[PDB]
Amino acid sequence: AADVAGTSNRDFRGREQRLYNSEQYNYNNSLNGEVSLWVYAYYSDGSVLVRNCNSQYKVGISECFKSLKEVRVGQNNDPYDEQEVNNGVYYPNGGEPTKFHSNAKPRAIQIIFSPSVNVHTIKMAKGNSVSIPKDYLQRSHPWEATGVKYRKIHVDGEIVGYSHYFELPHEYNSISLSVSGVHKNPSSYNVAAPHNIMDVFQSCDLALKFSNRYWCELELINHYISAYAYPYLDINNHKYGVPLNGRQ
Amino acid sequence: AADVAGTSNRDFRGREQRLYNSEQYNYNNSLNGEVSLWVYAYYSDGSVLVRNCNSQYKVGISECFKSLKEVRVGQNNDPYDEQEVNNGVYYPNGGEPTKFHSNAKPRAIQIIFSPSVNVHTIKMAKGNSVSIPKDYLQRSHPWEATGVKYRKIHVDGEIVGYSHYFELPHEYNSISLSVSGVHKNPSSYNVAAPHNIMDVFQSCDLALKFSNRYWCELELINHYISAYAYPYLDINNHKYGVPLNGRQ
Amino acid sequence: AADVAGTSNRDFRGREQRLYNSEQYNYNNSLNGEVSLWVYAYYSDGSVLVRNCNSQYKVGISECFKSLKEVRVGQNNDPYDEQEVNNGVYYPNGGEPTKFHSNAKPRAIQIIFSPSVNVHTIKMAKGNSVSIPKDYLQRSHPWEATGVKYRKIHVDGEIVGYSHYFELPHEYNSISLSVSGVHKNPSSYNVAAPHNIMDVFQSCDLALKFSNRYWCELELINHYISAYAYPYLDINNHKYGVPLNGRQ
Ligand SMILES: Nc1nc2c(ncn2[C@@H]2O[C@H](COP(=O)(O)OP(=O)(O)OP(=O)(O)O)[C@@H](O)[C@H]2O)c(=O)[nH]1
Ligand SMILES: Nc1nc2c(ncn2[C@@H]2O[C@H](COP(=O)(O)OP(=O)(O)OP(=O)(O)O)[C@@H](O)[C@H]2O)c(=O)[nH]1
Ligand SMILES: Nc1nc2c(ncn2[C@@H]2O[C@H](COP(=O)(O)OP(=O)(O)OP(=O)(O)O)[C@@H](O)[C@H]2O)c(=O)[nH]1
Ligand SMILES: Nc1ncnc2c1ncn2[C@@H]1O[C@H](COP(=O)(O)OP(=O)(O)OP(=O)(O)O)[C@@H](O)[C@H]1O
Ligand SMILES: Nc1ncnc2c1ncn2[C@@H]1O[C@H](COP(=O)(O)OP(=O)(O)OP(=O)(O)O)[C@@H](O)[C@H]1O
Ligand SMILES: Nc1ncnc2c1ncn2[C@@H]1O[C@H](COP(=O)(O)OP(=O)(O)OP(=O)(O)O)[C@@H](O)[C@H]1O
Ligand SMILES: [Cl-]
Ligand SMILES: [Cl-]
Ligand SMILES: [Cl-]
Ligand SMILES: [Mg+2]
Ligand SMILES: [Mg+2]
Ligand SMILES: [Mg+2]
């Protein structure tokens, strides 16, 4: 006759559950694991474009002014008029659109990394509308190291991810955007030294990308974030994610 | 008076032909040569999307669920309805398309490598519809090493390429897909060690890509495969390619 | 009472201006600086597609036959007919378009690098319409080193950039195109050796891209080149750029 559940050190079902969750958390943090990046572009109509990349060793996303704009697939997007918006945004008075402010422009950006990133390695190039980091190429460092600004997304006392959020509320907030982060490596084994370097090149090939525009934050939270155990931070500063280490 | 053709060791025209073919085969296998990857997505209407990349040192292709779907350029693709298909495939009951199964979904994938690949280096991430390799990121190795499954495409006793083929016949066969392979290097000279590493970075830049949807396998065989001396394996297990080493 | 402007060595405003310009020029040339690449595709209707990438350490652009073709956003591009053009260009007599020559085909290409490139590192793969560098993969070196052909764009005796220009005036000038260059590094410190290699991988992530089709060379010169202090060479061999080193 077996011990009774939840009363002794022989609840092996319980120990196996805790190990299963701990193994996933720590595997993700091993050099064999993913590091993941999400870039969220929020539009005035309440919809949200997500750009996601999942890869070994390091991960990144690179967007231009045009690629960040809202596209409603299979609906009217006034493509000619929006090309004229682009011309008017690349150079002042450079186009002839029928509008002052395109509602396809993002109102905000949230950058989220998986908990397997090392925040000290995070780099971002938030450039102008023609993809220069700081106004002119000749004065541009090709990135800023913005890790100190990333907030921890905590759930149940566990870091389930990292967030950097900035609004684009002003008419001159017209941007291009690239972001990069490196997977944790507390060892002194360089994953990109000659013993393993070609595998890092293969990781550039193997990185999986995902993009979709969700009709609102609720839908994103329900059918993307929660569905796939991703970290998130909503407009009301509510934290989402699944804590795993040492937990049932 | 010259020797008679095909009767002696002084048929220099004959020797030059054989060397020409041998030189092409072996150049392709040198570190100076191409390694090439083709991903074929087969649709129920009989058409075939090819994605090709040709590059030095290593090569790869990365696709998401959406990018693998059939697009008939300049014809009706019901873009709104197919966006709803995507929503319904990213999460169950997540959309409202007018169909149960999109005929734009691939029925099968064939992955073919040039004979200059080392099959031991082949990696594939066959992920789910939101670009996670194995259901959740926390448990995902970012690839599987599938080389042992690649079949040799033989012609005249020569390996003209390698094939891995899998059908997607079930309703739940909704995938994302990345593939990578490394060019043969039997030497102990690491092409990505510091003496040559920046050239491997340049190869990422220089890799040439090609995509097209052919109306059927016959057309692909005739105007793509055969036209450009590529390897192929058709649905009837017939092998295509041009044998070169030691041959006239 | 301060010295009079432009009469002595105590015009600190003057010295600061000259240093400001010199600092930008030399920063651009430091390993911290950008290296930039522009590929210009010129169309018969006088418009010009620019593809630009700006990145640390090294930079590149890769295009196929299709991606180089003129696309007039929000206007009629006869997409079905132009897909048939593609089929007819990938293989002779392979399509059924309503035209002999597509006016969407580029008439010329100009490749321009920032002055921070090392011309000895420049590589180009000018391939055929199906993205093979030299007719067949088996005989293809994956690039040509074309630096000796690049012309210096001089302004006021300063090199503000480098240009390689080739026309595509013949019916058989149907190409694919990739180009790559490496940022100057006169030091013996290898930026891609293990001490800094992962940063070069991050630079692949962080590279910012830009594309736009301008209606004519005048507009490109005015609202792109000149607006953002880029180098250029127009059809009349007129040089554009801003000289900076040692200059007010
Ligand atoms: N830790 C703790 N949790 C409480 C307390 N009161 C209510 N709770 C709830 O209980 C949850 C934690 O329960 P457990 O996971 O079983 O307890 P634990 O502290 O993690 O201990 P172990 O999992 O056995 O290591 C919390 O998420 C709370 O919502 C309390 O006093 N202490
Ligand atoms: N090898 C071989 N080929 C045959 C034979 N009978 C018919 N053939 C045909 O001949 C072809 C090969 O001819 P060759 O290439 O001239 O002969 P080989 O064996 O390759 O000899 P070398 O090219 O001179 O080294 C094959 O593809 C067959 O289709 C036979 O008995 N032996
Ligand atoms: N150098 C030079 N410039 C001239 C001369 N005559 C007219 N110019 C104009 O003057 C410009 C250069 O003027 P400066 O920049 O003040 O002279 P500089 O030779 O560069 O000398 P510093 O800037 O003081 O080092 C040129 O771009 C010319 O258009 C001349 O004889 N010599
Ligand atoms: N009432 C409680 N008393 C004592 N410990 C608690 C209580 N509730 C939770 N904890 C414990 O405190 C730790 C942190 O959990 P907590 O719920 O505060 O994290 P959180 O979700 O980041 O909190 P919040 O989001 O509310 O700021 C966990 O180990 C948890 O078990
Ligand atoms: N009738 C034959 N007798 C002897 N050798 C042959 C004959 N036909 C071909 N060969 C030789 O056998 C070797 C293998 O050629 P073979 O035609 O069997 O390759 P294959 O195209 O892979 O065959 P298959 O596709 O029919 O399985 C070659 O060196 C070829 O010259
Ligand atoms: N009339 C002049 N007499 C002497 N030096 C000059 C004169 N005009 C310019 N320079 C100097 O000559 C150097 C080269 O300037 P220059 O204007 O010839 O360059 P550039 O723009 O490449 O010429 P161009 O485009 O006309 O061939 C600069 O240092 C400049 O100060
Ligand atoms: Cl590890
Ligand atoms: Cl070699
Ligand atoms: Cl430096
Ligand atoms: Mg607990
Ligand atoms: Mg023979
Ligand atoms: Mg001067």
Author numbering:
A (entry chain A), B (entry chain A), C (entry chain A): 1 to 248
Original authors' sentences:
We use as an exemplar the successful structure determination of a novel polyhedrin from a cytoplasmic polyhedrosis virus (CPV) which infects the winter moth Operophtera brumata from our ongoing studies into polyhedra from insect viruses. Another engineered expression system, the baculovirus–Sf9 system, exploits the ability of the virus to induce the expression of the protein required for the production of viral inclusion bodies within insect cells. As expected, the structure of OpbrCPV18 polyhedrin is very similar (r.m.s.d. of 0.23 Å for all 248 Cα atoms) to that of BmCPV1, although there are several notable differences which will be reported elsewhere (Ji et al., in preparation). We have determined the structure of a novel cypovirus polyhedrin via in cellulo crystallography.
In this work, we present a novel approach whereby crystals are investigated in cellulo by mounting frozen live cells directly in the X-ray beam. The data obtained are of high quality, comparable to that obtained from isolated crystals, and enabled a facile structure determination. From a total of 40 in cellulo crystals identified from grid scans, 20 were integrated successfully by FastDP with the correct space group assigned. The 20 selected crystals displayed similar unit-cell parameters a = b = c = 103.04 Å, with a standard deviation of just 0.1 Å. BLEND determined that the inclusion of all crystals of a standard sufficient for automatic data integration produced an optimum data set in terms of both completeness and R value. Not only does the in cellulo approach reduce the time and effort required, it also maintains the samples in a biologically relevant environment, e.g. in the presence of other cellular components and under cellular ionic conditions. The workflow enabling the structure determination is both time-efficient and sample-efficient, and has produced high-quality data from significantly fewer crystals of only 4–5 µm in diameter, representing a crystal volume roughly an order of magnitude smaller than that of the crystals used for previous analyses. A clear benefit of the in cellulo method is the reduction in crystal handling, which minimizes manual effort and preserves the sample in a favourable and stable environment, as suggested by the unit-cell parameter observations.
